[PDB]
């Protein structure tokens, strides 16, 4: 029995060992209660405004669209404390942990952004934080590991399976099954078993609500489309949620195409994977023919989640949202273009969304369209990655 539907159509559910079902039920009840509690909402709004810096700007980018009939706005989640949208929902989930009388946080991380976001939220709110990270990820994300430790978090390398993100995902769940009376599992995207896809959407939906109010103020109408990159689905569902019922507004999610869909080296399960059951949910997966879970590949480590949130799979199935892919080279071009023409260094994750908007513009330059890209994060973190590619291509 649950209070809320655990499925979006056929996608979603609660595919966890029995021992974890009380933990999920507890969390669902606390969430439902919190959502009706004005004191909780006021505390959440206070942290979002005065600690994280909401509302975030909506920037009109003129140079990049000059001479076309595209008007492009960027929703500036890159300006949020922490430098990415992840901060919004970790603050919400930390408050949920407190609501449930918990003093400890468990989190998983791949690229390390969610580890950093969990560690910052935990430091602010006086929670003891432990972060699981695939041993391979630990080795290649030294800056993020150090940030987590500076913030007082314990970072625990995971050596099982492929020693990457999906493996940390498993290990976080294993710890929680023993510790859930005192610890909250702070899941890092809008995926996993119910109630996480719902919670993460509702704790990110201020992105779309603000976007709507800002575009109405600035342009006097809704956007033709809002465009967001899709790793696990959190920034995209946060942008999309408030517009779902505005049926004239296109919802475009962009998965990483990596070296090209046809190469198989990509991270686009929603459009090019196969539905499976893993990490507590029924959803499109990167998997082998015989059902072993595989890794997502992208230039952007942040888009490597090998599955996608169930609500995206559902919105796609009914035709409410459209999903596309952008390759590493396309994302790299968009990254350089924004730096040079607007003086904003975008996360390589966000650069996938921008690349698709630039394609919409360039393919049909006399089409009048009002687009918003969710600029999910800033790209300081990516400059060595970009440097290395540019040198190797002999762009020097």
């Amino acid at each position: 029995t649950t209070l809320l539907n655990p499925y979006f159509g056929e996608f979603g559910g609660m595919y966890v060992p029995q021992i974890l079902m009380p933990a999920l039920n507890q969390l669902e009840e606390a969430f439902v209660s919190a959502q009706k509690d004005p004191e909780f909402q006021a505390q959440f709004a206070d942290l979002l405004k005065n600690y994280a810096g909401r509302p975030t700007a909506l920037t009109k980018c003129q140079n990049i669209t000059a001479g076309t009939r595209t008007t492009l706005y960027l929703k500036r989640e890159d300006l949020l404390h922490g430098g990415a949208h992840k901060t919004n929902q970790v603050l919400g989930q930390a408050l949920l942990a407190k609501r449930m009388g918990k003093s400890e946080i468990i989190a998983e991380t791949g690229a390390g952004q969610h580890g950093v976001a969990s560690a910052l939220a935990s430091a602010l709110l006086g929670l003891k934080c432990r972060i699981y990270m695939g041993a391979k990820d630990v080795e290649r994300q030294s800056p993020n590991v150090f940030r987590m430790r500076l913030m007082g978090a314990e970072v625990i390398p995971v050596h099982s399976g492929s020693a990457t993100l999906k493996d940390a995902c498993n290990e976080a769940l294993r710890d929680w099954s023993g510790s859930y009376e005192t610890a909250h599992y702070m899941l890092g995207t809008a995926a996993g078993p119910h109630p996480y896809p719902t919670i993460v959407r509702e704790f990110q939906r201020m992105i779309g609500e603000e976007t709507k109010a800002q575009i109405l103020d600035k342009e006097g109408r809704l956007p033709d489309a809002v465009i967001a990159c899709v790793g696990g689905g959190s920034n995209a569902i946060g942008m999309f949620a408030d517009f779902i019922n505005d049926t004239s507004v296109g919802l475009i999610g962009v998965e990483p195409g990596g070296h090209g869909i046809e190469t198989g080296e990509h991270g686009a399960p929603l459009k090019h994977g196969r539905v499976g059951i893993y990490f507590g949910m029924k959803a499109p997966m990167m998997q082998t023919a015989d059902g072993q879970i595989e890794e997502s590949y992208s230039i952007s480590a942040g888009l490597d989640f090998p599955s996608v949130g169930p609500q995206h799979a559902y919105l796609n199935s009914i035709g409410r949202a459209d999903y596309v892919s952008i390759t590493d080279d396309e994302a790299l071009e968009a990254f350089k273009t924004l730096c040079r023409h607007e003086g904003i260094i975008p996360a390589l994750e966000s650069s996938h969304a921008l690349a698709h908007a630039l394609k919409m513009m360039r393919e049909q330059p006399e089409k009048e369209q009002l687009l918003v890209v969710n600029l999910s994060g800033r790209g300081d973190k990516d400059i060595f990655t970009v440097h290395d590619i540019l040198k190797a291509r002999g762009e020097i």
Binding site: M21, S160, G291
Partner: protein, 256 residues
């Protein structure tokens, strides 16, 4: 599931508990795994629990995580595991064989088709480790259509509603993971559950006898057998000796 019904009836007539070891199929390789399994049987296993290597064994601790890795290092696939299962059944007509599966391996090519292949190769039960009772309907329906017992875990944090659900929906045995122990066992009997096998921390003979004394039908050694494999990789001959020794001792502890 009939093989479990027959086993428990036979054990009950002998006032005897069941001893059930777990191993990962194909750990440390297909040939050695087949030898390991025949050794467990000869040494006195009453039933087997057998895992199919999976990339993401959520319900599993370090010991079994590492067994999965060994089997993958040996290139073991689900198709190879099903060939192994057919050979195991062909050698041993009455022992109940249960699988420990993850949902994606069951769903991957169709849930019904999965249970049909289980029936073809002679499997008696399936426990899907990441499917709680709340999600179990298509799995238990397919199992029963193919004469396979659906096995459910009764966890430490069970409640009355869960006991009644596990009691109603399960067949073969109830997988008990340690309400007090004697109370769970008594309540499961009251609700006409499949006979309980204790699966928590069964690593020594005294724990087997304790399980039977508590009222359970027997005990499952979830990881101790795999630990003996891990410890003895360099000497297959010694590995088999130590497995035989261990299973013999554990089975003795079940006997009246």
């Amino acid at each position: 599931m009939e093989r479990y019904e027959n086993l428990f009836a036979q054990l009950n007539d002998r006032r005897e508990g069941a001893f059930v070891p777990f191993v990962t199929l194909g750990d440390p390789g297909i040939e050695q795994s087949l030898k390991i399994i025949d050794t467990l049987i000869d040494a006195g296993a009453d039933a087997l629990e057998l895992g199919v290597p999976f990339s993401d064994p959520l319900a599993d601790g370090p010991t079994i995580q590492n067994a999965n890795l060994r089997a993958f290092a040996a290139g073991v696939t689900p198709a190879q595991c099903f060939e192994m299962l057919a050979l195991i059944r062909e050698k041993h007509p009455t022992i109940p064989i249960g699988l420990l599966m993850y949902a994606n391996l069951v769903f991957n090519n169709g849930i019904d088709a999965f249970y049909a292949r289980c029936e073809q190769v002679g499997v008696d039960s399936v426990l899907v480790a990441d499917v709680p009772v709340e999600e179990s309907a298509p799995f238990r329906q397919a199992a029963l259509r193919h004469n396979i017992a659906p096995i459910f875990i009764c966890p430490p944090n069970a409640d009355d509603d869960l006991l009644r659900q596990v009691a109603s929906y399960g067949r073969g045995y109830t997988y008990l993971l340690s309400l007090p122990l004697h109370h769970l066992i008594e309540k499961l009997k009251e609700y006409h559950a499949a006979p309980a096998l204790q699966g928590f921390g069964i690593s020594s003979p005294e724990q087997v006898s304790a399980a039977v004394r508590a009222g359970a039908a027997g005990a499952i050694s979830g990881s101790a057998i795999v630990k003996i494999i891990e410890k003895n990789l360099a000497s297959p001959k010694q590995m088999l000796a130590e497995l035989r020794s261990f299973v013999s001792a554990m089975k003795a502890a079940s006997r009246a």
